[PDB]
C-alpha cells in the first residue's frame, strides 16, 4: 500500500457548501477528507456506505449532489455514522481472512503499520506523538491485500505518545447496517418473563413518568421512578394524588414521604444516599432523563443497572425525549426566531427588543451567573421586572405568578418546574474539561462552549407546553449530543467519596455498568485511571470535606484533599480565590511552595512537586488513556496505491 | 466605564469580505473587533486612524466601502499598524493629563482595571489567566475620562498568569502620525562623521553586497561585508576580484584569505568565531541579509551593533531586500501560476504536470528532507534527472550544468547560489516554537507553518534573473515578515555556549543591542529568562557537546546537556530518536526514569523531576514572560458607556 492526498476545496467553498448542503463535485476515491466548521477528519467508503466517526460527524448531514444527505446509520455506542454513498463512489470491500499486519492510512497520506490485538485494537510498531494522528479519525485500517479491516477512532496513549489504535471493526458496520434503521420506542415495554433493560423514547408530555408508571401499577407492579430534579420529583407526588388517585411515596434529600403506595418517586441523589436498591422493593425501575450527563444521574443509573437484576426487578426502563444522536427538530407549538442586532438590550453580541419582554413571563438563559446578574440589573434599570436565578439562590426568587423576566443558568432546569411565554437562549454553556497536562498531573478547566442539541431542546422546551411559545436564539448551531467529558467521570468518583460513602472500586463497577449498556451517553473509557488516583487520596481531613460540601462547588473531594495536604505542610493554597476560603482562617500562618496534586484553577504560588501523593498521581498518569483523534463537506481525498 | 459588544458579521460574510476587501457596513463605535482567516483581535480608532497590532494584522489591507484600505502606518518595532478610518467612523482621542488609573477593554466587552506603572506598562489590580486576555490585542487602555491611553499588545506572565499588561502608548501613535508616510532607505548612505546605523533597502541587483562596498572602498574606506551564506560570501568575493579588480580578504570557515585589501568579506559565523570587531579594523560594516533570523545572523549583527562604535567604525549599514513589514509585489520577469489538481505528480494537495518540468532547469521546494527524497524517487521514475538537496548533503551533488530538476529545502538558499527557469513552492516551512508548558519546564516543538513574505520572496527569487521565469505555487498569501520566535533567542544562547565561547551575560549584551536597534526583526523580549536558564547549565560534558556540534542538529548545547545529566545518572534519554544517538553506545548500562530538564521532542521513557537542574530551570520559569495575547475584516464592535463609570 501507498497513498497520496488531493485537496479539492479551499476555505470559501467549504463554508458556502456547508450552508447550502450542495456538493456538486464528483466523489472519486474511497477515502475522503471531510470538514465541519471546526473539525477536519477522514471518511471511508465500505460496502456502498460512506463511514466515519460520530465524535467528528455528529448527527450532521453530508453535502451532496442534490442537497444535504441525512445519515442512514448512526451508532453512537460504536462512534459510527454513515451516509448512503453518492453515485460514482468506489468502495473498499471488507476483509474476510484478516491478517494481523494492518496499515493505517492517516490524513497526511502516511501509511502506518499496525499489529492487531483485539477485535478493535491495534498496536503501532513505531510509537508516535498523539498529535501526529489527530485529524485521522475515520481513516481506514487496511490489510495488505488493500481490503478494509475497520475505521480508526482513538489512539491509546502513554504520557502523550500513541502506542495503540482503537478502531471500529468492519463487522460492527455489517451489524449496524442490518439493525433496524427505524425502531419504535414510544410505547412502554411489557414486563418480560425475566430481566431486561429497555428504552423509552417519548417527547415530554407522553406521561413517561406519570401515565406509564400508573399503567404498570394498575397491572399490579411495584414501580420506582428515578429523576434528577427535586422540584420535579416532588411535583409528581402532587400531580399523582390528583390525576391518578395514588398518593405515591416521595424520596428527596430535602423531604421524603412513605405512604406505603406501590409507586415511589425519587431523585437519583436520594436513591444513592440510601445504598441503591433494596432487594424486593421494586419490579420496574424507570430512569427518567437518562440523557442527563451529570455525575449523580450517571452514578445513579449505573447503580440501577448494576444492582436491579439482583434486587428482584424484571424491568429497567431508560426513558428520555432526547437519546444520544438525536436532532433538534421543529416543534409544532413553538415559533423559533433569530435574535437580530436592532434591539434595546445587548445580549451575547445580538440584541433584544424591549417590546419582546415587557409584560408576560419570559426566560433568558445565560451561561454564567455573572452575566445573569449583570442582565437582571440592566432590565430592572429599565423598569422591567427581572430576576436572576442560578446555583446558590433559592427558587422563591422566581415569582410563581405575574410578569417577570427570569435570567437563569441551567441550574433552573433542576430547580424550578414552571413554563414560560417565551424563551431567549444565548446558545452556549459552561463545561468542565480535564486536560492531561502533566504540569504536574491533570487540570480541570472551565470553558464556554456551544450548546449541544440536548441542551437546546431542554432550554427551548420551557416554552410551548400545551400553549404557544416563542424561542429566540443567538445562533442556530447544535454540537452533537450524548457524549460527555472524562471530567464527568472524575466528578462521579469525587461524588462517590464526598457524599455516598462509595470506595472508588465500587464507583467503578457502577460506572462500568453505565458504559457497557447501549443507548446511553458515551464517554472515553477512563474508569481505571480515575479509580487509581482516588484510590491514593487517603486520610482526607473530615473538617475540610465538610466546608467544601457546605459551599458546594465542584470537586469537593479534590478541593478538600489539596486543602488537606496544604495544611499538613503549613503550605499555602494554589491561590486565595473562593475555592480556598476554607483556609482563610490560617492565611497569615502558612508560607512556602504549594504541594500541588493537580490544577483545579489558576495557581498563583510557588509550587513544589516533591510530595509523595503528587508523585503517586504522576505515576497514575502513565496509564493507557484512550483519546480521540450546517453540513459536513468533502474538502479532499486520499488515493491508495504493497 | 462599561462596555458591550455587537457582532456585525457572520463567518461567511467575513470570508466574502476578506477576499473582495469591500465592506459597506457603516463603521460605528471606536473599538472594532477585527478578524483574519487565522485569528481575531481588536482594532481601536484613534485620531482618525484605525490602529491595531502588527502581530495580528501583518501588512494586510483592511476591507472598506470602496475596496481594500492600505496601511497608512506600519511600525513593526512598536508592534503597531494603522489604516485611515473610513469617513464616518468615530474615534477615541488621547488623554490630556496622565491619571494613573486605567481601564483595559477586553474583546469580551469586559473592562478590567489597570495601574499605570511606567511608560507602557500597567499592572492588573486583579491577576487573571492569560487565556482570558486572548484576542484582545489592539484594544484600548482608557483613562477614567474615556480617553485613549494606549493600545494593548501583550501580557506579562508568571507561570501563565497575567500580572501586568504592555501597551503601545498613544504618544508613540502621535509621533507616527506627525511624520512621513514614505521614507527613502533605497540608496547607500554617505559615511557620517561619527557613528551611525543606517538602513539600506534595495533589490538583489542593487549590488549592495558588491557594488556599494566597492563604492565605499573607491572613496578610500575599509569596509567589512557580513553575509549569512558561505556560498554567497565566496561568490561575492570572486566576482569582486574579477569584475572589479580588488582581491578582497575572505573570512569563512571553509576558506580564509588575507590579501591586505581594504574590503573584507565574511560570514557572520566566522566574524563571531574571530571574536567580532577588532579595534581599528574597519570603518564601514555592511550587514547584508539583516532580515535573516538564524541565530548566527542575529548574534552577529548584535555583536556588530554592540561593538562597532567602540572599535572605531563610522557606519553600520543594515542591508536587505525585504525589511520587516515588506510585502510580495509582483515581478517584471516572473509569471506566477497557481499549481492545481490536474497533473501527473502529486504535490502538497495539488499536482505538478510533467510537461511543466520535463526539460530544462527547475527547483522544487519542499518543507522537509523526507518529502524531498520521496519526490526525488518519484521524478526518477518518470525519468527526469532530479536530485534532492538538503542540510547534510553536499552542494556539488547538483549539476551546474546538465538538465536537472532540483528538489530542495531552504538549505538550498545558503549552500547553492545558482538560479533556475522555474521554481515550484509548496509555500510552507518548518519552524520551532517554544511552549512554556511547565511540564516540567518548556518545550521546543518543530512545526510546519505557512511561509512568511521573506520566504516567498527568497524562494521565488531563485528565478527571473535577467530573463523569463515561471513561479508555480501551492498556496497564495503569506504570513507577515519581521517576527521571530523566542526559540530563536534560545538558539542564540545555545550557539554562544556551543560555538563561540560566549557566556550568557555576554550574549545578553549582544542581543540586547539587536533588540534596541530599530528596523530589525522583532521579538518577544525573553533575554533575562534564557540568560538565566543557560547560566545554570554548568559542567556540561565536552565529548557530548562535540558530537552534537558535529552532528549539525539544533540546540546542540541543550541536547548535549540533557545527555550529560543522563549519562551521569546512568539514566536513558527521553527517547531513542536520532537526537540521542550520542548515548546509543551506552544503551546497555542506562536504566530508570530520565532526569528530564526540558522537552525537545517526544519523551518516551518514564521521567523524574528531582534533578537539581530540573528544579533550577523550573524556578527560572517564575520569570516575567511577555506573551502575545485577504484583508482584515471588521466582524463586530465593542460599545463604551458615554457617561457614568
Ligand atoms: N470528548 C468526549 C468524547 C469523545 C468521543 C467519544 O466517543 C466514544 C467513546 C466511547 C465509546 C463510543 C464512542 C466519547 C466521548
Ligand atoms: N515591542 C517589541 C515587539 C514588537 C513586535 C513583536 O511581535 C511579535 C514577536 C514575536 C512573536 C509574536 C509577536 C514583539 C515584540
* Runs of H (alpha helix) within A404-447: 411-415
What is the rounded distance in angstroms from the CA atom of residue A483 to the CA atom of residue B432? 35
What is the rounded distance in angstroms from the CA atom of residue A344 to the CA atom of residue A347? 10
**Domain end: B268, B294, B324, which one?**
B324
- Quote the longest CA-to-CA distance of chain B: 78
What is the rounded distance in angstroms from the CA atom of residue B291 to the CA atom of residue B272? 18
Residue B104, beta-bridge partner list: B112, B141
Alpha-carbon separation of residue A195 from A192, A264, A305, A319, A519 (angstroms): 7, 20, 11, 17, 17
What is the rounded distance in angstroms from the CA atom of residue B241 to the CA atom of residue B496? 33
Q: Is A153 in the pocket of ligand 1 (CB under 6 A)?
A: no
Alpha-carbon separation of residue B394 from B390, B391, B405, B463, B552 (angstroms): 8, 8, 16, 22, 13
Q: Is A55 in the pocket of ligand 1 (CB under 6 A)?
A: yes
Question: With helix as H, strand as E and coil as C, how does B78-109 read?
Answer: CCEEEEECCCCCCCECECCCCCCEEEEECCCC
Nearest-CA distance B8 → chain A (Å)? 8
Instruction: Report CA(A621)–ligand 1 centroid distance (Å).
Output: 20
DSSP-based three-state secondary structure for A493: helix
Alpha-carbon separation of residue B200 from B74, B215, B322, B331, B455 (angstroms): 18, 14, 10, 20, 19
Q: Is B55 in the pocket of ligand 2 (CB under 6 A)?
A: yes
CA-angle at B140, arms to B26 and B144, nearest 5°: 110
Nearest-atom index, ligand 1, CA of A78: 12
Residues 6+ apart with CB under 8 A from B24: B65
A568 — phi, psi (to 5°)? Answer: -80, 30
- Find, among A585, A588, A584, A614, the residue nearest to A599 by Cα: A614
Q: Is A524 in the pocket of ligand 1 (CB under 6 A)?
A: yes
B29 CA to centre of own chain? 34
CA atoms within 13 A on the CB side of B564: 20
Q: Which DSSP state fits B226? A: E
Q: Which DSSP state fits B68? A: P
- List residues of A with catalytic annotation: 55, 79, 137
CA-angle at A325, arms to A320 and A331, nearest 5°: 65
Mutation test of ligand 1: which of A524, A526, A625 has the most ligand atoms closer than 8 Å to its C-beta? A524
B503 — phi, psi (to 5°)? Answer: -75, 155
Task: Answer yes or no: are the C-beta atoms of B474 and B349 closer than 8 Å.
Answer: yes
C-alpha cell at A396: 422563591
Among all bound ligands, the one having the nearest atom to the CA of A137 is 1
Residue keyed to cell 524531498: B372
Do both A364 and A442 map to the same domain? Answer: no
Nearest chain B residue to A158 by CA: give it: B604
Q: At what angle do helices A612-620 and A527-535 cross, to 10 degrees?
A: 170
Nearest-CA distance A630 → chain B (Å)? 12
Nearest-atom index, ligand 1, CA of A486: 2
**After which residue numbers is chain B interrupted with C–N beyond 2.5 angstroms?**
629
Catalytic residue, chosen from B120, B136, B137, B487, is B137
Burial class (CB in 10 A: 0-12, 13-18, 19+), A56: buried
Is B525 annotated as catalytic? no
C-alpha cell at A128: 508516535
Q: Which of A12, A19, A603 sits opposite B159 (nearest CB)?
A: A603
Is B326 annotated as catalytic? no
Task: Answer yes or no: are the C-beta atoms of A574 and A562 closer than 8 Å.
Answer: yes
Task: Answer yes or no: are the C-beta atoms of A7 and B339 closer than 8 Å.
Answer: no
Can you give the length of chain B in residues?
A: 645
What is the rounded distance in angstroms from the CA atom of residue B458 to the CA atom of residue B451? 11
> Domain containing B532 — which CATH number?
1.10.820.10
Do both B158 and B107 map to the same domain? Answer: yes
Residues 6+ apart with CB under 8 A from A549: A498, A499, A556
Nearest-CA distance B314 → chain A (Å)? 50
Residue keyed to cell 473610513: B86
Do both B149 and B66 map to the same domain? Answer: yes
Q: Is A489 in the pocket of ligand 1 (CB under 6 A)?
A: no
Q: Based on the structure, what is the number of domains in chain A? A: 4
Residue keyed to cell 430576576: A387
Do both A401 and A506 map to the same domain? Answer: no
DSSP-based three-state secondary structure for A578: helix
Among all bound ligands, the one having the nearest atom to the CA of B57 is 2
DSSP-based three-state secondary structure for A508: helix
Do both B469 and B512 map to the same domain? Answer: no
DSSP-based three-state secondary structure for A46: strand
Q: Order of strands, edge to edge, in the sheet holding A80-84? A: A3-7, A633-640, A31-35, A40-46, A49-52, A80-84, A73-75
Residue keyed to cell 458546594: A552
B223 — phi, psi (to 5°)? Answer: -120, 130
Count helices and strands in chain B by DSSP H and E runs: 16, 35
User: For the range A605-614, what are the long-range contacts, defined as Cβ-Cβ under 8 Å and sequence gap of 24 or more?
Assistant: A605/A572, A605/A573, A605/A574, A605/A575, A606/B622, A607/A574, A608/A571, A609/A440, A609/B440, A609/B609, A610/B610, A611/A565, A611/A569, A613/A536, A613/A537, A613/A565, A614/A440, A614/A441
Count helices and strands in chain A by DSSP H and E runs: 17, 32
The reply to whether residue B127 touches residue A604, judged by beta carbons under 8 angstroms, is yes
Burial class (CB in 10 A: 0-12, 13-18, 19+), A241: middle
C-alpha cell at A85: 454513498
- Quote the longest CA-to-CA distance of chain A: 75
Does any CB of chain B come closer than 8 Å to the CB of residue A577?
Answer: no
Q: Is A79 in the pocket of ligand 1 (CB under 6 A)?
A: yes
Mutation test of ligand 2: which of B524, B527, B625, B629 has the most ligand atoms closer than 8 Å to its C-beta? B524
Do both B207 and B130 map to the same domain? Answer: no
Task: Answer yes or no: are the C-beta atoms of B520 and B301 closer than 8 Å.
Answer: yes
What is the rounded distance in angstroms from the CA atom of residue A244 to the CA atom of residue A211? 8
Alpha-carbon separation of residue A468 from A321, A471, A629, B275 (angstroms): 20, 10, 44, 84
- Find, among A526, A534, A486, A483, the residue nearest to A506 by Cα: A534
State which H helix or E strand residue A431 sits in: strand A428-435
Among all bound ligands, the one having the nearest atom to the CA of A522 is 1
What is the rounded distance in angstroms from the CA atom of residue A255 to the CA atom of residue A238? 13
What is the rounded distance in angstroms from the CA atom of residue A636 to the CA atom of residue A35? 9
Alpha-carbon separation of residue B553 from B292, B297, B545, B560 (angstroms): 19, 17, 12, 11
**Domain end: A481, A496, A519, which one?**
A481
Residues 6+ apart with CB under 8 A from B268: B226, B227, B228, B296, B297, B299, B300, B301
Do both A487 and A540 map to the same domain? Answer: yes
The reply to whether residue B161 touches residue A602, judged by beta carbons under 8 angstroms, is yes
What is the rounded distance in angstroms from the CA atom of residue B188 to the CA atom of residue B204? 14
Q: Which of B12, B341, B604 sits opposite A161 (nearest CB)?
A: B604
Residues 6+ apart with CB under 8 A from B542: none
* Residue B522: count of CB within 10 angstroms of its CB: 21
Alpha-carbon separation of residue A497 from A431, A540, B554 (angstroms): 22, 10, 49
State which H helix or E strand residue B16 sits in: helix B11-20
Nearest-CA distance A259 → chain B (Å)? 54
Catalytic residue, chosen from B23, B55, B326, B410, is B55
Nearest chain B residue to A375 by CA: give it: B4
CA atoms within 13 A on the CB side of B609: 26
B211 CA to centre of own chain? 28
What is the rounded distance in angstroms from the CA atom of residue B106 to the CA atom of residue B51? 16
What is the rounded distance in angstroms from the CA atom of residue B11 to the CA atom of residue A459? 25
Does any CB of chain A come closer than 8 Å to the CB of residue B19?
Answer: yes
- Nearest protein Cα to ligand 1, atom 5: A55
Question: Quick one: resolution in A?
Answer: 2.9
Instruction: Report CA(A41)–ligand 1 centroid distance (Å).
Output: 15
Do both A222 and A290 map to the same domain? Answer: yes
Q: Is B202 in the pocket of ligand 2 (CB under 6 A)?
A: no
Task: Answer yes or no: are the C-beta atoms of B22 and B63 closer than 8 Å.
Answer: yes
Name every chain B residue with its beta carbon within 8 A of the beta carbon of A15.
11-12, 15
**What is the four-CA torsion angle of B592, B597, B598, B604, rounded to 10 degrees?**
0
C-alpha cell at B230: 558561505
State which H helix or E strand residue A472 sits in: strand A469-473
* Residue A410: count of CB within 10 angstroms of its CB: 19
Q: At what angle do helices B486-499 and B527-535 cross, to 10 degrees?
A: 40
- The DSSP result for B280-340, as a single string, is TS-SEEEEETTT--SHHHHHHHHHHHHHTTTTT--EEEEEESS-TT------SSEEEEE-B
Question: With helix as H, strand as E and coil as C, how does A225-284 read?
Answer: EEECCHHHHHHHHHHHHHHCCCCCEEECCCCCECCCCCEEEEEHHHHHHCCCCCCCCCCE
What is the rounded distance in angstroms from the CA atom of residue A344 to the CA atom of residue A339? 12
- Find, among A541, A474, A539, A525, the residue nearest to A156 by Cα: A525
- Find, among B567, B602, B566, the residue nearest to B439 by Cα: B602
Instruction: Report CA(A98)–ligand 1 centroid distance (Å).
Output: 26
Q: Is A362 in the pocket of ligand 1 (CB under 6 A)?
A: no
State which H helix or E strand residue A506 sits in: helix A504-515
B26 — phi, psi (to 5°)? Answer: -45, 135
Instruction: Report CA(A517)–ligand 1 centroid distance (Å).
Output: 14
C-alpha cell at A415: 430547580
Task: Answer yes or no: are the C-beta atoms of A599 and A490 closer than 8 Å.
Answer: no
What is the rounded distance in angstroms from the CA atom of residue A254 to the CA atom of residue A310? 29
What is the rounded distance in angstroms from the CA atom of residue A46 to the CA atom of residue B231? 55
The reply to whether residue A349 touches residue B639, judged by beta carbons under 8 angstroms, is no
What is the rounded distance in angstroms from the CA atom of residue A603 to the CA atom of residue A595? 11
A34 CA to centre of own chain? 24
- The DSSP result for B360-420, as a single string, is SEEEEE-SSHHHHHHHHHHHTTTT----EE-TTS-GGGS-SSSSEEEEE-TTHHHH----B
Q: Peptide bond before B57: cis, by omega within 30 degrees of 0?
A: no
β pairing state of A148-158 and B443-450: unpaired
What is the rounded distance in angstroms from the CA atom of residue A481 to the CA atom of residue B391? 50
Q: State the Rg of chain B over Cα.
A: 26
Name every chain B residue with its beta carbon within 8 A of the beta carbon of A428.
none
Give the range of the structural domain holding residue B415, as residue numbers without chain letter: 325-426+452-481
> Domain containing A14 — which CATH number?
2.40.10.120
Do both B134 and B178 map to the same domain? Answer: yes
* Runs of H (alpha helix) within A112-229: 130-133, 170-178, 211-218
Residues 6+ apart with CB under 8 A from A495: A295, A296, A299, A557
Name every chain B residue with its beta carbon within 8 A of the beta carbon of A610.
610
Q: Peptide bond before B401: cis, by omega within 30 degrees of 0?
A: yes
- Nearest protein Cα to ligand 2, atom 10: B523
C-alpha cell at A43: 471518511
What is the rounded distance in angstroms from the CA atom of residue A74 to the CA atom of residue A55? 11
From first CA to last CA, the distance across chain A in angstroms is 4
Residues 6+ apart with CB under 8 A from A166: A120, A121, A152, A153, A154, A155, A156, A626
Alpha-carbon separation of residue B321 from B47, B291, B327 (angstroms): 33, 8, 11
β pairing state of B249-251 and B263-267: parallel
Does any CB of chain B come closer than 8 Å to the CB of residue A400?
Answer: no
Task: Answer yes or no: are the C-beta atoms of B436 and B487 closer than 8 Å.
Answer: no
Does any CB of chain A come closer than 8 Å to the CB of residue B129?
Answer: yes
- Find, among A317, A309, A319, A237, the residue nearest to A277 by Cα: A309
Task: Answer yes or no: are the C-beta atoms of A441 and A414 closer than 8 Å.
Answer: no
Name every chain B residue with its beta carbon within 8 A of the beta carbon of A438.
439
> Domain containing B200 — which CATH number?
3.40.50.300
What is the rounded distance in angstroms from the CA atom of residue B439 to the CA atom of residue A380? 48
Do both B33 and B133 map to the same domain? Answer: yes
What is the rounded distance in angstroms from the CA atom of residue A484 to the CA atom of residue A515? 11
Task: Answer yes or no: are the C-beta atoms of A608 and A148 closer than 8 Å.
Answer: no
Do both A175 and A215 map to the same domain? Answer: no
- Find, among B473, B517, B38, the residue nearest to B323 by Cα: B517
Answer yes or no: is A490 a known binding residue.
no
Answer yes or no: is B147 a known binding residue.
yes
The reply to whether residue B5 touches residue A349, judged by beta carbons under 8 angstroms, is yes
Task: Answer yes or no: are the C-beta atoms of A86 and A76 closer than 8 Å.
Answer: no
Q: Which DSSP state fits B131? A: G
DSSP-based three-state secondary structure for B494: helix
State which H helix or E strand residue B514 sits in: helix B504-516
- Identify the experimental approach: X-ray
Do both B636 and B613 map to the same domain? Answer: no
Question: With helix as H, strand as E and coil as C, how does A524-567 read?
Answer: CCCHHHHHHHHHCCCCCCHHHHHHHHHHCCCCHHHHHHHHHHHH
DSSP-based three-state secondary structure for B603: coil
C-alpha cell at A350: 445580538
**Domain end: A290, A324, A358, which one?**
A324
Q: Is B628 in the pocket of ligand 2 (CB under 6 A)?
A: yes
What is the rounded distance in angstroms from the CA atom of residue A544 to the CA atom of residue A553? 13
DSSP-based three-state secondary structure for A32: strand
What is the rounded distance in angstroms from the CA atom of residue B549 to the CA atom of residue B539? 16
Q: Which DSSP state fits A521? A: -
The reply to whether residue B7 touches residue A349, judged by beta carbons under 8 angstroms, is yes
What is the rounded distance in angstroms from the CA atom of residue A363 to the CA atom of residue B417? 71
Amino acid at each position: 500500500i501507498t497513498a497520496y492526498s488531493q485537496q479539492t476545496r479551499g476555505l470559501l467553498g467549504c463554508i458556502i457548501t456547508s450552508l447550502t448542503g450542495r456538493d456538486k463535485n464528483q466523489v472519486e476515491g474511497e477515502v475522503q477528507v471531510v470538514s465541519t466548521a471546526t473539525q477536519s477528519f477522514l471518511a471511508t467508503c465500505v460496502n456502498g456506505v460512506c463511514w466515519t466517526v460520530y465524535h467528528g460527524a455528529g448527527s450532521k448531514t453530508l453535502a451532496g449532489p442534490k442537497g444535504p444527505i441525512t445519515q442512514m446509520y448512526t451508532n453512537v455506542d460504536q462512534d459510527l455514522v454513515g451516509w448512503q454513498a453518492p453515485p460514482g463512489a468506489r468502495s473498499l470491500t471488507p476483509c474476510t481472512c484478516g491478517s494481523s499486519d494492518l496499515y493505517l492510512v492517516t490524513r497526511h497520506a502516511d501509511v502506518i503499520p499496525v499489529r492487531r490485538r483485539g477485535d478493535s485494537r491495534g498496536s503501532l510498531l513505531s510509537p508516535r506523538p498523539v498529535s501526529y494522528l489527530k485529524g485521522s479519525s475515520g481513516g481506514p485500517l487496511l490489510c495488505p491485500s488493500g481490503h478494509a479491516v475497520g475505521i480508526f477512532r482513538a489512539a491509546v496513549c502513554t504520557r502523550g505518545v500513541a502506542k495503540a489504535v482503537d478502531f471500529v471493526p468492519v463487522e460492527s458496520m455489517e451489524t449496524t447496517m442490518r439493525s433496524p434503521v427505524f425502531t419504535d420506542n414510544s410505547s412502554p415495554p411489557a414486563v418480560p418473563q425475566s430481566f431486561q433493560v429497555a428504552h423509552l423514547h417519548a417527547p415530554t408530555g407522553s406521561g413517561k413518568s406519570t401515565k406509564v408508571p400508573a399503567a404498570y401499577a394498575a397491572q399490579g407492579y411495584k414501580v420506582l421512578v428515578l429523576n434528577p430534579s427535586v422540584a420535579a420529583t416532588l411535583g409528581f407526588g402532587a400531580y399523582m394524588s390528583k390525576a391518578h388517585g395514588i398518593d405515591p411515596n416521595i424520596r428527596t434529600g430535602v423531604r421524603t414521604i412513605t405512604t406505603g403506595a406501590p409507586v415511589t418517586y425519587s431523585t437519583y441523589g436520594k436513591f444513592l444516599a440510601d445504598g441503591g436498591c433494596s432487594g424486593g422493593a421494586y419490579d420496574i425501575i424507570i430512569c427518567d432523563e437518562c440523557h442527563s450527563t451529570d455525575s449523580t444521574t450517571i452514578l445513579g443509573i449505573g447503580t440501577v443497572l448494576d444492582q436491579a437484576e439482583t434486587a428482584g426487578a424484571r424491568l429497567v426502563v431508560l426513558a428520555t425525549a432526547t437519546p444520544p444522536g438525536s436532532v433538534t427538530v421543529p416543534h409544532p407549538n413553538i415559533e423559533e426566531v433569530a435574535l437580530s442586532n436592532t434591539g434595546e438590550i445587548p445580549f451575547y453580541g445580538k440584541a433584544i427588543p424591549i417590546e419582546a419582554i415587557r409584560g408576560g413571563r419570559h426566560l433568558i438563559f445565560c451561561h454564567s451567573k455573572k452575566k445573569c446578574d449583570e442582565l437582571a440589573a440592566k432590565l430592572s434599570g429599565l423598569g422591567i421586572n427581572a430576576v436572576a436565578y442560578y446555583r446558590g439562590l433559592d427558587v422563591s426568587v422566581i415569582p410563581t405568578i405575574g410578569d417577570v423576566v427570569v435570567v437563569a443558568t441551567d441550574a433552573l432546569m433542576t430547580g424550578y418546574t414552571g413554563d414560560f411565554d417565551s424563551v431567549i437562549d444565548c446558545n452556549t454553556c459552561v463545561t468542565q474539561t480535564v486536560d492531561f497536562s502533566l504540569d504536574p498531573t491533570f487540570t480541570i478547566e472551565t470553558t464556554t462552549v456551544p450548546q449541544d442539541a440536548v441542551s437546546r431542546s431542554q432550554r427551548r422546551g420551557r416554552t410551548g407546553r400545551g400553549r404557544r411559545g416563542i424561542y429566540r436564539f443567538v445562533t442556530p448551531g447544535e454540537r452533537p449530543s450524548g457524549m460527555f467529558d472524562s471530567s464527568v467521570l472524575c466528578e462521579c468518583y469525587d461524588a462517590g467519596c464526598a457524599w455516598y460513602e462509595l470506595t472508588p472500586a465500587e464507583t467503578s463497577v457502577r460506572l462500568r455498568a453505565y458504559l457497557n449498556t447501549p443507548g446511553l451517553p458515551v464517554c472515553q473509557d477512563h474508569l481505571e485511571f480515575w479509580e487509581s488516583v482516588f484510590t491514593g487520596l487517603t486520610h482526607i481531613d473530615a473538617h475540610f470535606l465538610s466546608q467544601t460540601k457546605q459551599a458546594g462547588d465542584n470537586f469537593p473531594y479534590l478541593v478538600a484533599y489539596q486543602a488537606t495536604v496544604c495544611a499538613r505542610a503549613q503550605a499555602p493554597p494554589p491561590s486565595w480565590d473562593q475555592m480556598w476560603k476554607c483556609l482563610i482562617r490560617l492565611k497569615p500562618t502558612l508560607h512556602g511552595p504549594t504541594p500541588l496534586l493537580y490544577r483545579l484553577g489558576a495557581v498563583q504560588n510557588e509550587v513544589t512537586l516533591t510530595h509523595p501523593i503528587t508523585k503517586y498521581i504522576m505515576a497514575c498518569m502513565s496509564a493507557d488513556l484512550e483519546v480521540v483523534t450546517g453540513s459536513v463537506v468533502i474538502v479532499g481525498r486520499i488515493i491508495l496505491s504493497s
